[PDB]
Design a protein around this ligand. Structure first.
Ligand SMILES: [K+]
Ligand SMILES: [K+]
Ligand SMILES: [K+]
Ligand SMILES: [K+]
Ligand SMILES: [K+]
Ligand SMILES: [K+]
Ligand SMILES: [K+]
Ligand SMILES: [K+]
Ligand SMILES: [K+]
Ligand SMILES: [K+]
Ligand SMILES: [K+]
Ligand SMILES: [K+]
Ligand SMILES: [K+]
Ligand SMILES: [K+]
Ligand SMILES: [K+]
Ligand SMILES: [K+]
Ligand SMILES: [K+]
Ligand SMILES: [K+]
Ligand SMILES: [Mg+2]
Ligand SMILES: [Mg+2]
Ligand SMILES: [Mg+2]
Ligand SMILES: [Mg+2]
Ligand SMILES: [Mg+2]
Ligand SMILES: [Mg+2]
Ligand SMILES: [Mg+2]
Ligand SMILES: [Mg+2]
Ligand SMILES: [Mg+2]
Ligand SMILES: [Mg+2]
Ligand SMILES: [Mg+2]
Ligand SMILES: [Mg+2]
Ligand SMILES: [Mg+2]
Ligand SMILES: [Mg+2]
Ligand SMILES: [Mg+2]
Ligand SMILES: [Mg+2]
Ligand SMILES: [Mg+2]
Ligand SMILES: [Mg+2]
Ligand SMILES: [Mg+2]
Ligand SMILES: [Mg+2]
Ligand SMILES: [Mg+2]
Ligand SMILES: [Mg+2]
Ligand SMILES: [Mg+2]
Ligand SMILES: [Mg+2]
Ligand SMILES: [Mg+2]
Ligand SMILES: [Mg+2]
Ligand SMILES: [Mg+2]
Ligand SMILES: [Mg+2]
Ligand SMILES: [Mg+2]
Ligand SMILES: [Mg+2]
Ligand SMILES: [Mg+2]
Ligand SMILES: [Mg+2]
Ligand SMILES: [Mg+2]
Ligand SMILES: [Mg+2]
Ligand SMILES: [Mg+2]
Ligand SMILES: [Mg+2]
Ligand SMILES: [Mg+2]
Ligand SMILES: [Mg+2]
Ligand SMILES: [Mg+2]
Ligand SMILES: [Mg+2]
Lengths: 51, 102, 97
RNA sequence: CUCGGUGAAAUUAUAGUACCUGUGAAGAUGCAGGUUACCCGCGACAGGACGGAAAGACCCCGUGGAGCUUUACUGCAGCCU
RNA sequence: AACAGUGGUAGGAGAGCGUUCUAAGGGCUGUGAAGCCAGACCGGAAGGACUGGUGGAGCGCUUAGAAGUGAGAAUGCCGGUA
RNA sequence: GUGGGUAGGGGUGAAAUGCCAAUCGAACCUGGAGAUAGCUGGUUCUCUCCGAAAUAGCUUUAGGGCUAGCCUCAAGGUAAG
RNA sequence: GAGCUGUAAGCAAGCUUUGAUCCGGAGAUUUCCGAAUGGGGAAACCCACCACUCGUAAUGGAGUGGUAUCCAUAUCUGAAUUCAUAGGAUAUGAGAAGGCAGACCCGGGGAACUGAAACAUCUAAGUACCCGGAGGAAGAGAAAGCAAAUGCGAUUCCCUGAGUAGCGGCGAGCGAAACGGGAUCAGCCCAAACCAAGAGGCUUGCCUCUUGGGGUUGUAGGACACUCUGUAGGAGUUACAAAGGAACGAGGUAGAUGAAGAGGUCUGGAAAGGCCCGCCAUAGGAGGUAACAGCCCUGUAGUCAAAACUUCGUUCUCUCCUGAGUGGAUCCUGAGUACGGCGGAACACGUGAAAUUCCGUCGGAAUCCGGGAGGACCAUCUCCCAAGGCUAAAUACUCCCUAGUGACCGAUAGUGAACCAGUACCGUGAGGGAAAGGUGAAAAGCACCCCGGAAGGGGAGUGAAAGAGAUCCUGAAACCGUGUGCCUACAAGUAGUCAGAGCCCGUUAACGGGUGAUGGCGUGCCUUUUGUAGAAUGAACCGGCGAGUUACGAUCUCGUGCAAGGUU
């Protein structure tokens, strides 16, 4: 939902695992990654903007 | 370099992989070392004044420094190199055990 | 260019002038006013906010194309004769502002 | 010119590259019909290859240029007032 | 299926081939990549494989994207050699 | 002979437009500059569908151009041709 | 922190844990030429004078420093000429000079080709170019503004307005601005009245000049008077006065530390590759390493580090400093100015209906009961207060330095230049201006033998490979050769094609391959043309390179989203 430092740092070095905020979601990142791991807070934040 | 003249090292790569030996000389500018008994070449020396007879001389040729690792003093196994400050002096230490290489 | 035949534009005369003080109004026909519910004071600010008109220009003129079946207090800069009739005919009040 | 030494060039679509009469962008080694001709050179000669050389100087065209002229046009310097 | 059509310059229209690079996916490759050489293979064309030799480290394929994307002529330019 | 002077819309000329670095009806170099070229040359893979024109009018126009004519593609009208 | 005395091998002689080489900060030295400056000169040379120093008995010789011009300031002399002044002399000056980054900026001067299908107004274009001046930016800037609202409030730049308004042989073309939306924001100091003090002309209580105070503007402000009020809180070296110091913090200019596999096994010259297993990861950036490495090395993430010089910020210090009201007696508020005529230029605006701005020339105001502007002009109204100055930021550009990036190049490309290139070479000169990358992982760079004067070669050895042996990866084509399966010395040839024996082969196995006696048919390719085998054009051959692109607008088709709305 917000900029999680620990998650962003922990995932940084794993190949093929990108971390974004809710506002930083984009078509290319969604389509390029197989799985989409969203938090409940982030889903609410996405639904705020898009819906 | 991570090794120096005088160090016993294991050759970890090349034809002489597995062979231990002392570094007879180091070449920091080329990142190469001369290890005793390792990478022998047959030089075809013509008759000079310095070498009067000539002939085919068997001599060590340098290998790349990244193909050798220093031995751990405890186990005798290869080790990566760390550094600690002891008595003011910096010393190389075996990362495997902990003990001082030099 | 017509290969040296006197070009069309140049054969024909210039006509008219441009008025420095020309007013163009944002026109609104009666069919657009049907969008609003009865009792709504249709001001230029409301028309612009709702997006019935995109820009104001000199002002809002109400014109008399289409039908009106809503009692509205239409407030506008200008009205056509038929528009002012049609607003008043269906219970409304055309007000020049 | 012959032998020994050394060794360029212009040119050149590929060529196993006859002659006659004809034909054809109207003057053909190369097309047609005939006539003649074993294969490869060397010394010579220039009739042809519309031979080579140089995107014809002539001529015309370009709303191309340049130099020159004058009572062409429009200007400017200088000079006079 | 039937019927009809399919010469073509300028030129309009359509469908494709191949080249380099990128993305994603999926592969190949020191048990030998690209390139090069050869062959009597395949496709309607552009073209594409397969096998062997040379070579000695890179390269296809699929889908999409982007172009310094294709040469036989320019008295073209540079090189080489007649 | 040596040392000097004159410089390009200029110099110099016992005058030929002669000469000014194998350049002269206006030197050479660099730049404006990829000047402009209605002119000539060239313009690179394939197959299929269709397929002209070399005419009229006007044009400082006549080997250029424009509009019309003739070709092509698409969408309509539909069945006028 | 263990090697080192560069390219660059090599012998030589040495240095270095008593810390070298090497890296960074600050110093020292720094020939001669060059602005070049003691004078001269054909740059890198020559010749001086004056001090002091070395040397000689002395001359000759040598060393160090000073000695250009202009300008500023001061002092001393002071011509014709009386006082003077000009001029001269001397001293003090981190005063100027010259260069460049082929960029950006502001000025002075300023083309033409070209476009207009000719051409002169016009365009190209105030471009190129030359010249002057800069600065890190410059220029502009605090309303004699924009405008026409119950307004705005310095300038600059971006979006938009708008290819509009307009200008225009009303041709070709040229082409705004304000409003609106943003970036950034900051305002000030004088001149004058007047006051005080001093100076020199006494013009003789007047005037002029120089310092300090005072003062700073528009439904006017200030002087001047009034009563207030401050003289140290506030401000500051980026304008608003101008120097300096300390401390603290964060950067820059060297560095330090830094996790995890030689895992096993398989090919192999070598393993970073395959297969089967681990592990680290705030580190799976990158480069290297004998083939492709997060775990081999140099590193990377993270965290640290500076004696010295340096940048920024902060705080203190330091330095500097009253700002409000009420009155209209007078006084002040930028003069050869504004403005006008004439001639030009600049304004998008070409003399036009031509405001506005600037230059030359001549004429020439008002001065608060005043002046300017609102696109001729007048009136009214509105807005403003010129003829003085300063001012950061947003903006432009990149010779450089540091870090990094690319559906950018990969040796005819990419810089002209991957290499000792602005070199070689060419030119009197300005100037023009190339070609030229690849042994190998490592020199292990072929001891030795043999032919040869050598070159070169054949062995041998090294290497994974020498047909990797020095313009040494690969190694196409033209072109040049050696060998020979088929054909060829009675033949008339765009060289093929179709028919076809004979002979020789044997494949991607196909109603195969090579050759071709003989028969039929048959005038290359391209360009340009009414028409070309053409006795029209172009190409010696082979290879490489070599031509509808991109940007911004317009329009149409197709596609997609939304739809009387769509879109920023
Ligand atoms: K002909
Ligand atoms: K002849
Ligand atoms: K191959
Ligand atoms: K050619
Ligand atoms: K000249
Ligand atoms: K002359
Ligand atoms: K010359
Ligand atoms: K049409
Ligand atoms: K002109
Ligand atoms: K023209
Ligand atoms: K290694
Ligand atoms: K004017
Ligand atoms: K004047
Ligand atoms: K105003
Ligand atoms: K070059
Ligand atoms: K042969
Ligand atoms: K035949
Ligand atoms: K000819
Ligand atoms: Mg490590
Ligand atoms: Mg001879
Ligand atoms: Mg014919
Ligand atoms: Mg005839
Ligand atoms: Mg004939
Ligand atoms: Mg015949
Ligand atoms: Mg001839
Ligand atoms: Mg000719
Ligand atoms: Mg057809
Ligand atoms: Mg047919
Ligand atoms: Mg087409
Ligand atoms: Mg490739
Ligand atoms: Mg193969
Ligand atoms: Mg190309
Ligand atoms: Mg001459
Ligand atoms: Mg030009
Ligand atoms: Mg037409
Ligand atoms: Mg013209
Ligand atoms: Mg400055
Ligand atoms: Mg400066
Ligand atoms: Mg400034
Ligand atoms: Mg200041
Ligand atoms: Mg480390
Ligand atoms: Mg292992
Ligand atoms: Mg290899
Ligand atoms: Mg004033
Ligand atoms: Mg007016
Ligand atoms: Mg190459
Ligand atoms: Mg090059
Ligand atoms: Mg020379
Ligand atoms: Mg080979
Ligand atoms: Mg290699
Ligand atoms: Mg080679
Ligand atoms: Mg015979
Ligand atoms: Mg016979
Ligand atoms: Mg003809
Ligand atoms: Mg001929
Ligand atoms: Mg011709
Ligand atoms: Mg020719
Ligand atoms: Mg060629």
């Amino acid at each position: 939902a917000d900029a999680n430092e620990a998650v962003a740092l922990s995932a940084r070095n794993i190949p093929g695992v990108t971390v974004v905020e809710a506002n930083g979601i984009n078509v290319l990142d969604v389509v390029n990654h197989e799985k989409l791991l969203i938090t409940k807070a982030a889903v609410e934040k996405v639904e705020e903007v898009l819906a | 370099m991570h090794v120096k003249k005088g160090d016993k090292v294991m050759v970890i790569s090349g034809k002489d992989k597995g062979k231990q030996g002392t570094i007879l000389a180091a070449f920091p500018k080329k990142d190469r070392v001369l290890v005793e008994g390792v990478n022998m070449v047959k030089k075809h020396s013509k008759p000079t004044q310095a070498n009067p007879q000539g002939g085919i001389s068997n001599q060590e040729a340098p290998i790349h420094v990244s193909n050798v690792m220093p031995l751990d003093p405890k186990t005798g196994e290869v080790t990566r190199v760390g550094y600690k400050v002891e008595d003011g002096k910096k010393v190389r230490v075996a990362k495997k055990s902990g003990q001082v290489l030099d | 260019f017509e290969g040296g035949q006197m070009p069309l534009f140049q054969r024909l005369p210039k006509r008219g002038f441009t008025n420095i003080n020309r007013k163009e109004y944002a026109v609104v026909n009666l069919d657009k006013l049907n969008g609003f519910a009865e009792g709504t004071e249709v001001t230029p600010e409301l028309l612009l906010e709702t997006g019935v008109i995109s820009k104001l220009n000199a002002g809002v003129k109400i014109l008399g194309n289409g039908k009106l079946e809503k009692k509205l207090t239409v407030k506008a800069n200008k009205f056509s004769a038929s528009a002012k009739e049609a607003v008043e005919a269906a219970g409304g009040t055309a007000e020049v502002i």
